């Protein structure tokens, strides 16, 4: 508790989305309103970890990746179409 007062006297943690990476441990990431940047990856993170269309913790000074933030929900997978129990006067001929 006593130490935090300076800790949250801190700023720079940007948030990004990776379109896709390329060679030399780099990626292509667009910012929320802004354009797309080619940046550096973190020593603790892996290139194979970088999946396209995923958020990443960004620096504000060097825009260095801090942590590949988890997706919310795969929207098609949250809107996954129903496979309910598949159990009509007028509709028998077309049957």
């Amino acid at each position: 508790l006593r130490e935090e007062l300076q800790l949250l006297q801190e700023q720079g943690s940007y948030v990004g989305e990776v379109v896709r990476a390329m060679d030399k441990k780099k990626v292509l990431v667009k910012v929320h309103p802004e354009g797309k940047f080619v940046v550096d990856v973190d020593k603790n993170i892996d290139i194979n970890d970088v999946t396209p269309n995923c958020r990443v913790a960004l620096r504000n000074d060097s825009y260095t990746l801090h942590k590949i933030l988890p997706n919310k929900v795969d929207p098609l997978v949250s809107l996954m179409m129903v496979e309910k129990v598949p159990d009509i006067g007028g509709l028998d001929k077309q049957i």
């Binding site: 935090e4 949250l8 943690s13 948030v15 910012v31 913790a57 933030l69």
Partner: peptide, 10 residues
């Protein structure tokens, strides 16, 4: 207009 990644107070 922009979006950020931040910490919170306990």
């Amino acid at each position: 207009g922009s979006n950020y990644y931040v910490r919170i107070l306990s």
